[PDB]
Amino acid sequence: AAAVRNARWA
Amino acid sequence: MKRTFQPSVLKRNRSHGFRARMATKNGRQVLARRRAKGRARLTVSK
RNA sequence: GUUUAGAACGUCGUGAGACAGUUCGGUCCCUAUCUGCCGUGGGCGCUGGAGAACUGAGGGGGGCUGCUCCUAGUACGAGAGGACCGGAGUGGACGCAUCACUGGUGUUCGGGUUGUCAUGCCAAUGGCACUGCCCGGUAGCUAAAUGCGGAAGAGAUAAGU
RNA sequence: AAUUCCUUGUCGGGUAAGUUCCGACCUGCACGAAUGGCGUAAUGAUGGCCAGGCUGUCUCCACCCGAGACUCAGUGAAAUUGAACUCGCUGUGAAGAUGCAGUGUACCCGCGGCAAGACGGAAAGACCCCGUGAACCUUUACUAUAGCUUGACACUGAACAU
RNA sequence: GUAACGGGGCUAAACCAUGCACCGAAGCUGCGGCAGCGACGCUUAUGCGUUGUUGGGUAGGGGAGCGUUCUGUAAGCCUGCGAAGGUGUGCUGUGAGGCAUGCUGGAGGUAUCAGAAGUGCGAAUGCUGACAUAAGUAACGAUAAAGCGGGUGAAAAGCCCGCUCGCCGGAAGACCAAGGGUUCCUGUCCAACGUUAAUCGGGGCAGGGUGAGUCGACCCCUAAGGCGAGGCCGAAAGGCGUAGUCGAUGGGAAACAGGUUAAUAUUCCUGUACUUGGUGUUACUGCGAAGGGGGGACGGAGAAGGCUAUGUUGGCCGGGCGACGGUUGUCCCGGUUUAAGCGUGUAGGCUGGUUUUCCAGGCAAAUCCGGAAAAUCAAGGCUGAGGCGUGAUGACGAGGCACUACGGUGCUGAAGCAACAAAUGCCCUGCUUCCAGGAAAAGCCUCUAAGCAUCAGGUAACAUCAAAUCGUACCCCAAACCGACACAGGUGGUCAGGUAGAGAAUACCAAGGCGCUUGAGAGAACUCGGGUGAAGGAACUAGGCAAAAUGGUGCCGUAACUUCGGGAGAAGGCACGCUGAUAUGUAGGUGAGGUCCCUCGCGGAUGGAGCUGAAAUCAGUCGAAGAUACCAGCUGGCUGCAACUGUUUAUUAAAAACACAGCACUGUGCAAACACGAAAGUGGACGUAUACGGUGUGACGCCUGCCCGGUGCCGGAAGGUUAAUU
RNA sequence: GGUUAAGCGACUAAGCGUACACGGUGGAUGCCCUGGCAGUCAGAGGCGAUGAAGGACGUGCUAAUCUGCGAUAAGCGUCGGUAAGGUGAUAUGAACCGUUAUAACCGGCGAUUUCCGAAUGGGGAAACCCAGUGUGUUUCGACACACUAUCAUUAACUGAAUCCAUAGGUUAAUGAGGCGAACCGGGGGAACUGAAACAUCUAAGUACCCCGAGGAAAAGAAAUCAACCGAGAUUCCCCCAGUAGCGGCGAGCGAACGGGGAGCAGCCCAGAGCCUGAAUCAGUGUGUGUGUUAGUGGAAGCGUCUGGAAAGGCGCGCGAUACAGGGUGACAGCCCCGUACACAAAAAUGCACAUGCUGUGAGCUCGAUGAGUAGGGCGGGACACGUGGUAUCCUGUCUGAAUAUGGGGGGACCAUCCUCCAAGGCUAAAUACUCCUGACUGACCGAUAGUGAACCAGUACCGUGAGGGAAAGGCGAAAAGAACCCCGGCGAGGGGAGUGAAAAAGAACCUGAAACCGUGUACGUACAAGCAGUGGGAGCACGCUUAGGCGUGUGACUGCGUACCUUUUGUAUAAUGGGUCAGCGACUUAUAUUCUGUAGCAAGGUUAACCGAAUAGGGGAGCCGAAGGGAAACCGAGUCUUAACUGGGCGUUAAGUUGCAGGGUAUAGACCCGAAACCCGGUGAUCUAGCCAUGGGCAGGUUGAAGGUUGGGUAACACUAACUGGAGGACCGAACCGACUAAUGUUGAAAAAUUAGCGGAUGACUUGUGGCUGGGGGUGAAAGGCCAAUCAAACCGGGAGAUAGCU
Ligand SMILES: [Mg+2]
Ligand SMILES: [Mg+2]
Ligand SMILES: [Mg+2]
Ligand SMILES: [Mg+2]
Ligand SMILES: [Mg+2]
Ligand SMILES: [Mg+2]
Ligand SMILES: [Mg+2]
Ligand SMILES: [Mg+2]
Ligand SMILES: [Mg+2]
Ligand SMILES: [Mg+2]
Ligand SMILES: [Mg+2]
Ligand SMILES: [Mg+2]
Ligand SMILES: [Mg+2]
Ligand SMILES: [Mg+2]
Ligand SMILES: [Mg+2]
Ligand SMILES: [Mg+2]
Ligand SMILES: [Mg+2]
Ligand SMILES: [Mg+2]
Ligand SMILES: [Mg+2]
Ligand SMILES: [Mg+2]
Ligand SMILES: [Mg+2]
Ligand SMILES: [Mg+2]
Ligand SMILES: [Mg+2]
Ligand SMILES: [Mg+2]
Ligand SMILES: [Mg+2]
Ligand SMILES: [Mg+2]
Ligand SMILES: [Mg+2]
Ligand SMILES: [Mg+2]
Ligand SMILES: [Mg+2]
Ligand SMILES: [Mg+2]
Ligand SMILES: [Mg+2]
Ligand SMILES: [Mg+2]
Ligand SMILES: [Mg+2]
Ligand SMILES: [Mg+2]
Ligand SMILES: [Mg+2]
Ligand SMILES: [Mg+2]
Ligand SMILES: [Mg+2]
Ligand SMILES: [Mg+2]
Ligand SMILES: [Mg+2]
Ligand SMILES: [Mg+2]
Ligand SMILES: [Mg+2]
Ligand SMILES: [Mg+2]
Ligand SMILES: [Mg+2]
Ligand SMILES: [Mg+2]
Ligand SMILES: [Mg+2]
Ligand SMILES: [Mg+2]
Ligand SMILES: [Mg+2]
Ligand SMILES: [Mg+2]
Ligand SMILES: [Mg+2]
Ligand SMILES: [Mg+2]
Ligand SMILES: [Mg+2]
Ligand SMILES: [Mg+2]
Ligand SMILES: [Mg+2]
Ligand SMILES: [Mg+2]
Ligand SMILES: [Mg+2]
Ligand SMILES: [Mg+2]
Ligand SMILES: [Mg+2]
Ligand SMILES: [Mg+2]
Ligand SMILES: [Mg+2]
Ligand SMILES: [Mg+2]
Ligand SMILES: [Mg+2]
Ligand SMILES: [Mg+2]
Ligand SMILES: [Mg+2]
Ligand SMILES: [Mg+2]
Ligand SMILES: [Mg+2]
Ligand SMILES: [Mg+2]
Ligand SMILES: [Mg+2]
Ligand SMILES: [Mg+2]
Ligand SMILES: [Mg+2]
Ligand SMILES: [Mg+2]
Ligand SMILES: [Mg+2]
Ligand SMILES: [Mg+2]
Ligand SMILES: [Mg+2]
Ligand SMILES: [Mg+2]
Ligand SMILES: [Mg+2]
Ligand SMILES: [Mg+2]
Ligand SMILES: [Mg+2]
Ligand SMILES: [Mg+2]
Ligand SMILES: [Mg+2]
Ligand SMILES: [Mg+2]
Ligand SMILES: [Mg+2]
Ligand SMILES: [Mg+2]
Ligand SMILES: [Mg+2]
Ligand SMILES: [Mg+2]
Ligand SMILES: [Mg+2]
Ligand SMILES: [Mg+2]
Ligand SMILES: [Mg+2]
Ligand SMILES: [Mg+2]
Ligand SMILES: [Mg+2]
Ligand SMILES: [Mg+2]
Ligand SMILES: [Mg+2]
Ligand SMILES: [Mg+2]
Ligand SMILES: [Mg+2]
Ligand SMILES: [Mg+2]
Ligand SMILES: [Mg+2]
Ligand SMILES: [Mg+2]
Ligand SMILES: [Mg+2]
Ligand SMILES: [Mg+2]
Ligand SMILES: [Mg+2]
Ligand SMILES: [Mg+2]
Ligand SMILES: [Mg+2]
Ligand SMILES: [Mg+2]
Ligand SMILES: [Mg+2]
Ligand SMILES: [Mg+2]
């Protein structure tokens, strides 16, 4: 399995 | 790092053994399903 | 910093919560195929083969400047003050090369020393402990060390005469 | 002020220079007394600020020791991939071009490197919006309901006093 | 990057005004071909010099076909003179296609006209299988380290042997439990497995290997808890639970040393023991419970004392006279080991002891326990290390000679002592102390009931039997277990050598075990782990992040503030090596011989030999440096928050958050409130308001003001309003 | 000719491209079926304390596994069948047994039948542990059998409080326990979904859970319907009819009367006689008949040709109540097994008829005629019917009759009239289903299909567990499975040889495609810019032709030319999709309705169930059409509207109906794939959180509380000094535990770690072994944390193909 990171602008 | 599986024969037989399963009808229904499915190993007991 | 989940203040809301209000804490991945770029090779071509030295089409680098001195305390100015032009000297920044000097390093050189082990023992050595810890140090590499560079001069010109 | 929007408020201290810190001021945008107020020794991998020591943190990097990177031998992946005979510029164009137009440049092919671009790779976007989507949670949203509570009847009968 | 003619270039190759040419499209016209449609000429379901006209096309509508599998046609036809399938070639139709053939293959295939569909695939981050790409690139798994000679082999960096080197040594050693299940040993083999090769292996293959009265398990006994006759409850299922019955992680009988296998051993062998039952004999005889009592039987912390394990030194025995100066010496090396059991009962710990008597108590009884009195004894009893003796004229033992397959085998075999130090082990389930006040049962001991008291049974001494069954190899902080891996991770217990050190830290070593399953070169950038650094010293940066620095013991000295404890190791400073002297090895510790005493022993008092051994001072001496390495606090000042130790988002947040002691409010009278449960019941609690639950606040200090309108809560009940019911 | 100069200049291929040839990899295509799928006709619908289902371990000449079997262990006895061969399979071999009937094999009936499992002597972690009693054994150590669970029922014996009694207790007899597919009855009972939301409603009394029974079950013999005529139990089918109705009158739900069929069966008690054992039923024996469980016979061909082989070809025959099929070296009526027909049972058993016993009562007369019930109030449920004006049925609650001179019903209610007699029971058939047995069938599949499984498949494997769950078929006719030689490591692999029709069938074995990867040849390619092709085109190579030149391959050079799909106003777009190949993969099916086409009949058309030797025929029950208008009564080629229409609305000349095909619509999953979720039943506290029980661990070094003693002080204290003491969620710091900072690593050594530092380290510590709390629940010093790498509602299965106006 895995995960994600929203470093992008909100 | 300690994982989810720590072997214990006494605990394993007391939890899923033939006599533990057959004590209740719900476990006895598991045996009926496994007998109907034709499982080679009915319970976890050796 | 903003921009998650934690928490708190003020504020809003009955409340859950909310606030370009504020406070504290809080995971930034990718072994380069292609283009591009910096280097460095292989292949073939250039009309016999081969070894050298060149011409320079073309391309790139480089192009900064201060302060003193002389001109001259002259021109200018009542004075206070104070040059143009031109010529010297000495710096800053930048760049290149170099290690003679000044230094760094020099776990491959020499020495001192702690603990312990070994070489039968003593003595003398060696191993290990960050090179055990230190003191020095050749060559090399290196800068903070020291040499050099920016130009002058032409051609055609900009604005302008 | 963990609270002050205006705001880096004003004054003082600290610095060569302090939007932070410390002391005050009160003008409390929008503090406040057990959703505690103010103080408080000690404690804190607590937050902010200052000083000494200390240093390659930095001015400004140099050298050295190892492990990789490089070469040889052996074994031998991966994400990705429409197909490629996969240059620059200007312009155009589902509006930021290796592929179109024009034009320039460029012998064929490796190796070591750097990551500017291939709107690079990763994951049917978490922000925004939408669906008469989902879920939890809140309440004086709706409709109910467990529970709690009221009375009648039944279980439950007979004297007396008001 | 010229970039505002597409470019070149142009003074007309621009613009303006006239012309005549030419170029220019799938438009138009020619010359063929196909198809749709309209009214005709004859003929017309067909069709004819027809003719006119139309034919871009998504969504979509209409129409006509191809091909695939199957059924009828088809018990036909095609086919070992080569069917289907595959792979080429040729021809043909507007198309989906069709026809034929060469080769492959070796047994099916199927005309025609109808019928039926799992009837046509490039996409769906489609599904399954196969194969690419990156790519011979990354990686080959801790930087603890390897090297050589020899051997085996087809082949050796990796296997075997040997000699060095390096690593661990509170582990990276040894022994277990749990867990695994043969991985153990031997032989054999190198496909696959091993991140390379491999002769090797935890790989393949074939054999062998696990021996118990005493170790465990089983067994007896109970804890939490489970199950649970009857029982209670619940639509059914079922839930709870009594008597009971299970359930160790706990309590209960007994074995040690030596030797031995390729692999097992407190299990086999040797030697020497022990225990519980059964049976028999003999003697003496009150036995007896589903009963009673005792016992089992229990905390934390701390303090020593007595010991042993163990270590050191000396002595003794054996060996050595040194590859290079010295080494017959106070020299060097090695050894100096012995259990359970039995006897003694020691240091020490605990308790007064012994009779008689009574008694509504211990569910009845009791001779026991618990009570009441009286007498008399100055003791007695219990427990317990260790030592010593025995075990043991034995075993073991350096070494020795002979044989032999490097093993080995056989024989022999000296000394086998003392002092000192010393545990975290033992005495100790003790002692002392504290509050938070620290299992059970059975075995065991004792007491009597009923039921026997000739008997049985009990006690004692012999003899004798019996002690079954199961586990036992091996790994067990790891390549064998948990992590997909021969995985830098995790995993409980036991053992605890030397030097230095307070120490189980740390460094170097012993025993023992390893060098981590790809290497060999090269010595770029860059990256990682480190070393050093002129001068400056936080100018860096959000921030002294990181690094550097500090670091020990003794002594001196130490502020604000404080809850008087602290702050405090505050800060700051001084002394540390070696040698000698005091004092040839001191103070101290230990303590033999000897000499007295004993109602006599493991005795007491003297006594000081011999060992062990700081600390200080003085003097000398070496270095730049003596806490020299490793190891090992940076410090101070102001301030916010939280009192504090603690807890928390396993896997980006350890905080000011949560908890917290304390405080207050409120509920709760015990069949308590409350909570879990359709209920029974259970928790609360075997507690009782000095208690419990809920809520908020959050040590401590000083304090906590005003509002009851709103919303809740509490109390009242006259009136208004109001359900079922009648 | 030589020397210069200028111009031009092929030949090079490290490699690459295209074409062709030859291979490798791979297992598609085709062919095949001892496997599946759907059915038809029958049978059989249970097994079990006489120990089941399902297993464990054993058992052979046996090393493993499979299949059998159970210590009598691939088997023993007996009775039949049958027999010349035979000791199950992988799977040979060895050692043997048989051959005319005790080899073997098949069937009937027995014997044996370890251990676990309802499991039953007790216990237990299933295949293990521990007994008691009694009988019988003796080698005095022991040994062998038997019995000993619980509950229900019955009968004995004993036996409390408590005098009898009763409860209770002890025996002894019977019975029940469990397993199993669907169908059936009953007790409980969803949600997703639909309503384009969502409450009533729908889904649905479905899924699921629980209880019980049978081969069927259930229902069942009118207090029923009808309507003034009548019908006459129940069940099932076709109609009636998507009608009447129900319904936020929305979605949707949905009869009955009556008719046509299948099949029909009626009785008993509520009581006594007169008769009498009557009919009938059940037990059982006793035969017959017909099955079942082994079996027997079963017709008829040769020659020649091709070919490895004949069943094929070409000839000439023969059988057929047998030309159903299978096998045999290619396609067999006559080769083989069978098939059609004709036969068979020692023993067991089914079915049916008859008969004998054991029960069982038939008939007649006179009586009797189901009361806390009907009904009612309240609250619900069931009837198509949701409270509505709601009859009828069931009742949680509260009441409560009449009783034949009486009650019930006739869809509110009343009267009248019909009809029936509740409050006690029994009852076959027609109906539903298939775990299982046998035979047969298919415009069903043919190894990615068909069961998940054609193969040692519910296996390997995954998960703690519930549970999930694969991949994998083909040599040839016969293994004749390659003797021997050679290379190699006493290998692997390969070359010969040999076998065979073929090895171009060699076990990596039928056919062997494509992607992909090679070797060879031809051509092109090292000054050349881009979807890589197209139009033109030299040259070279090559095949034909005869010089007409065509054909093939390559292609210098040149004009033109920015992939495909999806989604869009618009994509070369720097928007989505795709590494490639092969295989698979999406508009179907059922019913109804409308329309079109077509066929038949026609003012008619046509049947459905069912019957039926049965695609025929029967059955016209019904359905549509020929007449409409109106709300309806009604009227009618008219009718309604209105008082009435000269009117107006709707109708009146116009052919339909039944098949078949097709286009739509409707209900079902409805073209395929995809949610996050909701609901139901289970599995998880071997991880983690808390708690419970029982054990363990915490080197070393400091600080020095209370208290105590001894002084000083006080009248005594207090106070003070010294010395003892050893207090603490005390200090420093290893083990141990935590995880604050930074670096590395992030296709990890590791799906959270390592290195250097960091905090705690006698406690609210830490740890071992057990135990307990379970999913709207747990647990939580509280973060929405944790509850098996998953948590704002775990996991598994089911509803389920939820739904998806979206892609
Ligand atoms: Mg921030
Ligand atoms: Mg940060
Ligand atoms: Mg970081
Ligand atoms: Mg980065
Ligand atoms: Mg030099
Ligand atoms: Mg150096
Ligand atoms: Mg030595
Ligand atoms: Mg070293
Ligand atoms: Mg120097
Ligand atoms: Mg100039
Ligand atoms: Mg000039
Ligand atoms: Mg000018
Ligand atoms: Mg501000
Ligand atoms: Mg200021
Ligand atoms: Mg301030
Ligand atoms: Mg406030
Ligand atoms: Mg308050
Ligand atoms: Mg702070
Ligand atoms: Mg400082
Ligand atoms: Mg290096
Ligand atoms: Mg790949
Ligand atoms: Mg490109
Ligand atoms: Mg552009
Ligand atoms: Mg490269
Ligand atoms: Mg980069
Ligand atoms: Mg909207
Ligand atoms: Mg023209
Ligand atoms: Mg045209
Ligand atoms: Mg067919
Ligand atoms: Mg062909
Ligand atoms: Mg063949
Ligand atoms: Mg299809
Ligand atoms: Mg390589
Ligand atoms: Mg690469
Ligand atoms: Mg590499
Ligand atoms: Mg390694
Ligand atoms: Mg070697
Ligand atoms: Mg070492
Ligand atoms: Mg093995
Ligand atoms: Mg081994
Ligand atoms: Mg090999
Ligand atoms: Mg092995
Ligand atoms: Mg023994
Ligand atoms: Mg044993
Ligand atoms: Mg023991
Ligand atoms: Mg119970
Ligand atoms: Mg019971
Ligand atoms: Mg135990
Ligand atoms: Mg104590
Ligand atoms: Mg000793
Ligand atoms: Mg010498
Ligand atoms: Mg004593
Ligand atoms: Mg062992
Ligand atoms: Mg061993
Ligand atoms: Mg593993
Ligand atoms: Mg551990
Ligand atoms: Mg350094
Ligand atoms: Mg410096
Ligand atoms: Mg310096
Ligand atoms: Mg700064
Ligand atoms: Mg720091
Ligand atoms: Mg301080
Ligand atoms: Mg502040
Ligand atoms: Mg975290
Ligand atoms: Mg953290
Ligand atoms: Mg608080
Ligand atoms: Mg008030
Ligand atoms: Mg109030
Ligand atoms: Mg076929
Ligand atoms: Mg809806
Ligand atoms: Mg039956
Ligand atoms: Mg026959
Ligand atoms: Mg009646
Ligand atoms: Mg009633
Ligand atoms: Mg009602
Ligand atoms: Mg109404
Ligand atoms: Mg209504
Ligand atoms: Mg009603
Ligand atoms: Mg396959
Ligand atoms: Mg083949
Ligand atoms: Mg060229
Ligand atoms: Mg072209
Ligand atoms: Mg498409
Ligand atoms: Mg694109
Ligand atoms: Mg893609
Ligand atoms: Mg029609
Ligand atoms: Mg008919
Ligand atoms: Mg009719
Ligand atoms: Mg009219
Ligand atoms: Mg249709
Ligand atoms: Mg549809
Ligand atoms: Mg502490
Ligand atoms: Mg502390
Ligand atoms: Mg934690
Ligand atoms: Mg990093
Ligand atoms: Mg893993
Ligand atoms: Mg500490
Ligand atoms: Mg929770
Ligand atoms: Mg939150
Ligand atoms: Mg989790
Ligand atoms: Mg939910
Ligand atoms: Mg599920
Ligand atoms: Mg559904
Ligand atoms: Mg779906």
PDB file of N, CA and C (backbone and C1' of nucleotides) in Angstrom, chain E residues 77-89:
ATOM      1  P     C E  77     -21.635 -39.330 -52.341  1.00  0.00           P
ATOM      2  O5'   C E  77     -20.908 -37.923 -52.493  1.00  0.00           O
ATOM      3  C5'   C E  77     -21.250 -37.045 -53.555  1.00  0.00           C
ATOM      4  C4'   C E  77     -20.631 -35.686 -53.359  1.00  0.00           C
ATOM      5  C3'   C E  77     -19.137 -35.670 -53.078  1.00  0.00           C
ATOM      6  O3'   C E  77     -18.363 -35.800 -54.266  1.00  0.00           O
ATOM      7  C1'   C E  77     -20.242 -34.301 -51.508  1.00  0.00           C
ATOM      8  P     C E  78     -16.752 -35.926 -54.246  1.00  0.00           P
ATOM      9  O5'   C E  78     -16.253 -34.830 -53.207  1.00  0.00           O
ATOM     10  C5'   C E  78     -15.610 -33.643 -53.644  1.00  0.00           C
ATOM     11  C4'   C E  78     -14.568 -33.196 -52.654  1.00  0.00           C
ATOM     12  C3'   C E  78     -13.487 -34.211 -52.327  1.00  0.00           C
ATOM     13  O3'   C E  78     -12.448 -34.231 -53.289  1.00  0.00           O
ATOM     14  C1'   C E  78     -14.337 -33.284 -50.325  1.00  0.00           C
ATOM     15  P     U E  79     -11.580 -35.562 -53.531  1.00  0.00           P
ATOM     16  O5'   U E  79     -10.856 -35.812 -52.134  1.00  0.00           O
ATOM     17  C5'   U E  79      -9.701 -35.069 -51.775  1.00  0.00           C
ATOM     18  C4'   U E  79      -9.244 -35.384 -50.374  1.00  0.00           C
ATOM     19  C3'   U E  79      -8.855 -36.828 -50.106  1.00  0.00           C
ATOM     20  O3'   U E  79      -7.537 -37.130 -50.521  1.00  0.00           O
ATOM     21  C1'   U E  79     -10.313 -36.107 -48.411  1.00  0.00           C
ATOM     22  P     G E  80      -7.204 -38.573 -51.142  1.00  0.00           P
ATOM     23  O5'   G E  80      -5.751 -38.899 -50.582  1.00  0.00           O
ATOM     24  C5'   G E  80      -5.517 -38.982 -49.180  1.00  0.00           C
ATOM     25  C4'   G E  80      -4.148 -39.535 -48.875  1.00  0.00           C
ATOM     26  C3'   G E  80      -4.015 -41.044 -49.039  1.00  0.00           C
ATOM     27  O3'   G E  80      -2.693 -41.377 -49.463  1.00  0.00           O
ATOM     28  C1'   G E  80      -3.607 -40.452 -46.781  1.00  0.00           C
ATOM     29  P     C E  81      -2.374 -41.599 -51.024  1.00  0.00           P
ATOM     30  O5'   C E  81      -2.785 -40.222 -51.712  1.00  0.00           O
ATOM     31  C5'   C E  81      -1.945 -39.077 -51.599  1.00  0.00           C
ATOM     32  C4'   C E  81      -2.119 -38.123 -52.756  1.00  0.00           C
ATOM     33  C3'   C E  81      -3.517 -37.540 -52.930  1.00  0.00           C
ATOM     34  O3'   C E  81      -3.487 -36.211 -53.483  1.00  0.00           O
ATOM     35  C1'   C E  81      -2.969 -38.875 -54.818  1.00  0.00           C
ATOM     36  P     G E  82      -2.351 -35.102 -53.154  1.00  0.00           P
ATOM     37  O5'   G E  82      -3.103 -34.070 -52.204  1.00  0.00           O
ATOM     38  C5'   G E  82      -4.424 -34.322 -51.737  1.00  0.00           C
ATOM     39  C4'   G E  82      -4.521 -34.188 -50.237  1.00  0.00           C
ATOM     40  C3'   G E  82      -3.787 -32.988 -49.634  1.00  0.00           C
ATOM     41  O3'   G E  82      -4.570 -32.434 -48.578  1.00  0.00           O
ATOM     42  C1'   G E  82      -3.062 -34.978 -48.595  1.00  0.00           C
ATOM     43  P     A E  83      -5.593 -31.229 -48.861  1.00  0.00           P
ATOM     44  O5'   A E  83      -6.782 -31.510 -47.841  1.00  0.00           O
ATOM     45  C5'   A E  83      -8.136 -31.508 -48.263  1.00  0.00           C
ATOM     46  C4'   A E  83      -9.059 -31.315 -47.089  1.00  0.00           C
ATOM     47  C3'   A E  83      -8.680 -30.170 -46.155  1.00  0.00           C
ATOM     48  O3'   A E  83      -9.263 -28.939 -46.539  1.00  0.00           O
ATOM     49  C1'   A E  83      -8.909 -32.150 -44.898  1.00  0.00           C
ATOM     50  P     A E  84      -8.406 -27.580 -46.476  1.00  0.00           P
ATOM     51  O5'   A E  84      -8.677 -27.017 -45.011  1.00  0.00           O
ATOM     52  C5'   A E  84      -9.977 -27.052 -44.439  1.00  0.00           C
ATOM     53  C4'   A E  84      -9.902 -27.153 -42.938  1.00  0.00           C
ATOM     54  C3'   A E  84      -8.952 -26.178 -42.265  1.00  0.00           C
ATOM     55  O3'   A E  84      -9.525 -24.895 -42.075  1.00  0.00           O
ATOM     56  C1'   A E  84      -8.588 -28.350 -41.410  1.00  0.00           C
ATOM     57  P     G E  85      -8.669 -23.563 -42.362  1.00  0.00           P
ATOM     58  O5'   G E  85      -7.437 -23.658 -41.356  1.00  0.00           O
ATOM     59  C5'   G E  85      -7.640 -23.727 -39.952  1.00  0.00           C
ATOM     60  C4'   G E  85      -6.338 -23.921 -39.219  1.00  0.00           C
ATOM     61  C3'   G E  85      -5.174 -23.057 -39.686  1.00  0.00           C
ATOM     62  O3'   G E  85      -5.171 -21.769 -39.100  1.00  0.00           O
ATOM     63  C1'   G E  85      -4.473 -25.290 -39.619  1.00  0.00           C
ATOM     64  P     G E  86      -4.871 -20.473 -40.000  1.00  0.00           P
ATOM     65  O5'   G E  86      -3.281 -20.396 -40.028  1.00  0.00           O
ATOM     66  C5'   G E  86      -2.517 -20.575 -38.844  1.00  0.00           C
ATOM     67  C4'   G E  86      -1.107 -20.994 -39.174  1.00  0.00           C
ATOM     68  C3'   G E  86      -0.400 -20.134 -40.208  1.00  0.00           C
ATOM     69  O3'   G E  86       0.167 -18.964 -39.645  1.00  0.00           O
ATOM     70  C1'   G E  86      -0.123 -22.413 -40.757  1.00  0.00           C
ATOM     71  P     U E  87       0.205 -17.594 -40.484  1.00  0.00           P
ATOM     72  O5'   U E  87       1.334 -17.847 -41.578  1.00  0.00           O
ATOM     73  C5'   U E  87       2.651 -18.223 -41.200  1.00  0.00           C
ATOM     74  C4'   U E  87       3.460 -18.635 -42.401  1.00  0.00           C
ATOM     75  C3'   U E  87       3.363 -17.709 -43.599  1.00  0.00           C
ATOM     76  O3'   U E  87       4.200 -16.571 -43.488  1.00  0.00           O
ATOM     77  C1'   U E  87       3.133 -19.957 -44.305  1.00  0.00           C
ATOM     78  P     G E  88       3.921 -15.282 -44.402  1.00  0.00           P
ATOM     79  O5'   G E  88       4.606 -15.644 -45.793  1.00  0.00           O
ATOM     80  C5'   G E  88       4.010 -15.245 -47.016  1.00  0.00           C
ATOM     81  C4'   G E  88       4.628 -15.959 -48.191  1.00  0.00           C
ATOM     82  C3'   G E  88       4.156 -15.503 -49.561  1.00  0.00           C
ATOM     83  O3'   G E  88       4.803 -14.327 -50.010  1.00  0.00           O
ATOM     84  C1'   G E  88       4.085 -17.854 -49.459  1.00  0.00           C
ATOM     85  P     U E  89       3.945 -13.141 -50.668  1.00  0.00           P
ATOM     86  O5'   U E  89       3.585 -13.676 -52.125  1.00  0.00           O
ATOM     87  C5'   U E  89       4.603 -14.139 -53.000  1.00  0.00           C
ATOM     88  C4'   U E  89       4.038 -14.958 -54.133  1.00  0.00           C
ATOM     89  C3'   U E  89       2.893 -14.325 -54.905  1.00  0.00           C
ATOM     90  O3'   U E  89       3.331 -13.367 -55.851  1.00  0.00           O
ATOM     91  C1'   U E  89       2.353 -16.566 -54.405  1.00  0.00           C
TER      92        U E  89
END
